[PDB]
Design a protein around this ligand. Structure first.
Ligand SMILES: Nc1ncnc2c1ncn2[C@@H]1O[C@H](COP(=O)(O)OP(=O)(O)O)[C@@H](O)[C@H]1O
Ligand SMILES: [Mg+2]
Ligand SMILES: [Mg+2]
Length: 735
């Protein structure tokens, strides 16, 4: 994701890296101050502080400091010391946030007139980067989105200086135009080169002595560190202004940093009685939503997750932290721990649960004393053994631990735990029975996963015809088509694989993060490939925009990045989608049903497989578009395909807080483009504890347009079943 950086960080970056003919004054003239600052060292290190008057202000991602009286202007060093005395180390409140002011920036005062303050901003969107200028900068700039000249530098296009002069700068003083345009051009090259997604300078001051950057707010695309570490260095990403982290949050963050597994923890209410430990990002949000929906918002202790297949040791270190946090003080009503998640596609549930079980053993004493009750619900590879050992440690330690499989609706355990219930162009068709795919990368377990599936589907031929992996020479890989053993050619060069298999029209790209961009661009030089699944997570947003541009040009459908893929029962499945054969059979993914779905998350997609197979004639096609800011294909892209697929009789969409994608579905129904029944639920309803982008706003708006929206995830299965039964009754669905 994009992440904010401090003003000092961005200024430093700008002073180091910007190439402009325009004279930029006061380069590197800034000093940082905290409660631990030695004012003697500071002064020795920054003797310029004595040269001239100064400005002092906090650097903690607080907006509008001028208006809030947090900017000391035109002071001597002594005046600065005295302005800081009542403020430094003191609590301040800004909006809903309260925290200590502990980080200040000191800079030279820059005399200038109001007319010498300008406004400039650059920010990213799917279609390119907008450059904004306004000739009246400063604390009174106002609604700049409405007032500023704007220019869009399209994906993979250049910023033309003539447009800067003749459009962006039309209202600027004529004698500042040349210097403003040189600066702006420089600023944009800098923006793009260093992988910024947002960059605001207000005010940009221009006097007779040149350009001064008085203020700067920015975000960088943090996934681009593998490219930009050379320029960024050890760049820090500050948290929002607010409370400081608890040591446990720090511990887990450090844990997160040393692994591909995503490990996240945030304490909401350390004294809360409801603790969660959830596998899957989607599931993590859904469990929180559920807890809030059932009245538990004030008892919700934490939110977070442990995803992307962590190891036993990692899960143990995670679990031990939570167990420690929930035993610092007793709750008069005892405490609940929710160990839930969706149905994993590839995580080893046995390994992860063994880690949790070790932790429970280590903390059993305080756990019994604190009257902790534990609820467990989880699916995935080896989940049966995982559930068994969790039940065992309960019996063994004397701790109450109720365990549940995939027959139990994911969120049902929250109700049980709270006592609310007893404890018991681009094409329409992407895949078919004929689909042949090339798989880029050495993923033999995944490929065998696809063959096993093809086999139980009674496919005539295997769905994978060849592999591509440039890190070795041509050779053959051995796989099993049932008990029969077959060979699959592995090519060093993509061209070879393509030419020898012209019947292939799908590529599944398992390229690691550093190869994913190039291999995908290369693939789209071969028109036979109409569909590409991009698995890798962590591809920079600006690169994904280029992939999207080319795909749109080329008529190629892209699923991903950052996705497990998707599945079309009876015909084809992408890589690890759908887990082991165990889960393929239980969810009946070996033959088609009438229900198509789309979601961002693959974790929740497997859950949808489960839910849909228990409440209907089953999945017809499911797709996970992945959770990147700019997915190669959108909810609406697939919903449209589904509308145009006779075999699809109803459509399920699991949406999400953020963005406005789902409103396209509304307009689609109101314009008569979409006519099949659509079930939708947007997760993230409690996240709140622009507004049209909330899950709540969206659920309500979709409900009003004729979309079947349940009251909560917990009723999602019910409504899917109800809409289905009506479709059977009306002769639309023939099981
Ligand atoms: N170094 C400086 N020299 C002169 N004036 C300054 C300086 N820094 C800030 N100002 C004035 O203070 C105002 C607010 O400062 P700024 O850093 O933009 O904080 P914010 O936008 O958070 O209010 C600016 O619009 C500018 O007019
Ligand atoms: Mg400002
Ligand atoms: Mg990680």
């Amino acid at each position: 994701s994009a992440k904010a950086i401090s003003e000092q960080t961005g200024k430093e970056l700008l002073y180091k890296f910007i190439c402009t003919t325009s004279a930029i004054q006061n380069r590197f003239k800034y000093a940082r101050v905290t409660p631990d600052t030695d004012w003697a060292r500071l002064l020795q290190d920054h003797p310029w502080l004595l040269s001239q008057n100064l400005v002092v202000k906090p650097d903690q991602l607080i907006k509008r400091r001028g208006k809030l009286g947090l900017v000391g202007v035109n002071l001597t060093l002594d005046g600065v010391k005295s302005w800081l005395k009542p403020r430094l180390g003191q609590e301040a409140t800004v909006g809903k946030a309260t925290g200590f002011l502990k980080n200040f920036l000191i800079e030279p005062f820059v005399p200038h007139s109001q007319a010498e303050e300008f406004y400039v901003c650059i920010y990213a969107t799917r279609e390119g980067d907008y450059v904004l200028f306004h000739h009246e900068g400063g604390v009174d700039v106002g609604d700049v989105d409405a007032k500023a000249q704007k220019l869009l530098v399209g994906v993979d296009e250049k910023l033309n200086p003539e447009d800067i002069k003749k459009h962006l700068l039309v209202h600027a003083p004529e004698d500042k135009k040349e210097i403003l345009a040189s600066f702006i051009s420089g600023l944009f090259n800098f923006y793009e080169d260093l992988y910024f997604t947002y960059l605001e300078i207000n005010p940009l001051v221009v006097t007779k002595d040149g350009v001064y950057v008085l203020d700067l707010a920015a975000k960088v695309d943090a996934t681009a560190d593998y490219i930009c570490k050379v320029k960024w260095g050890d760049i820090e990403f500050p948290p929002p202004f607010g409370r400081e982290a608890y040591p446990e949050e720090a511990y887990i963050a450090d844990l997160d940093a040393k692994s591909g597994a995503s490990l996240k923890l945030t304490l909401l209410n350390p004294k809360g009685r409801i603790w969660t430990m959830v596998a899957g990002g989607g599931a993590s949000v859904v469990y929180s939503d559920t807890i809030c929906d059932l009245g538990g918002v004030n008892e919700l202790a934490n939110y977070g997750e442990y995803s992307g297949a962590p190891s036993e040791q990692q899960t143990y270190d995670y679990a031990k932290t939570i167990l420690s946090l929930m035993t610092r003080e007793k709750h008069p009503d005892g405490k609940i721990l929710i160990i839930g998640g969706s149905i994993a596609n590839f995580t080893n549930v046995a390994a992860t649960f063994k880690g949790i079980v070790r932790a429970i053993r280590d903390y059993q004493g305080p756990l019994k004393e604190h009257e902790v009750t534990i609820f467990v619900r989880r699916g995935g590879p080896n989940y049966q053994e995982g559930l068994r050992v969790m039940g065992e440690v309960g019996k063994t330690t004397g701790i109450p631990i109720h365990v549940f499989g995939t027959e139990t609706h994911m969120t049902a355990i929250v109700g049980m735990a709270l006592g609310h219930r007893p404890i018991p162009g681009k094409s329409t068709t992407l895949f078919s029975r004929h689909t042949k795919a090339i798989v880029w990368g050495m993923q033999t377990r995944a490929v065998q996963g696809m063959l096993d599936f093809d086999y139980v589907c009674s496919r005539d031929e295997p769905s994978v015809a060849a592999m591509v992996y440039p890190f070795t020479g041509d050779h053959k890989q051995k796989f099993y088509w049932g008990h029969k053993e077959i060979l699959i050619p592995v090519f060093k060069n993509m061209a070879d694989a393509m030419r020898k298999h012209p019947e292939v029209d799908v590529l599944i790209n398992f390229a690691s993060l550093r190869s994913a961009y190039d291999s995908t661009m290369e693939t789209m030089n071969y028109a036979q490939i109409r569909t590409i699944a991009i698995i890798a997570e962590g591809i920079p947003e600006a690169l994904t925009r280029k992939l999207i541009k080319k795909a749109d040009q080329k008529g190629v459908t892209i699923i991903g990045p950052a996705t497990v893929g998707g599945i079309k029962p009876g015909c084809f499945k992408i890589g690890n989608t759908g887990g082991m054969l165990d889960n393929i059979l239980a969810s009946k993914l070996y033959r088609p049903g009438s229900v198509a779905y789309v979601s961002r998350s693959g974790g929740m997609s497997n859950e949808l497989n489960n839910i849909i197979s228990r409440t209907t004639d089953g999945v017809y096609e499911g797709v996970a578009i992945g959770g990147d800011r700019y997915p190669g294909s959108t909810f609406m892209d697939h919903v449209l395909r589904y509308q145009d697929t006779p075999g699809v009789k109803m459509i399920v969409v699991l949406g999400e807080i953020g963005g406005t994608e789902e409103y396209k579905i509304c307009r689609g129904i109101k314009e008569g483009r979409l006519t099949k029944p659509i079930v939708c639920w947007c997760i993230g309803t409690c996240a709140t504890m622009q507004a049209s982008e909330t899950a709540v706003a969206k659920n309500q708006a979709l409900k009003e347009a004729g979309v079947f929206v349940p009251r909560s995830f917990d009723e999602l299965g019910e409504i899917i079943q109800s809409v289905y039964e009506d479709l059977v009754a009306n002769g639309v669905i023939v099981p």
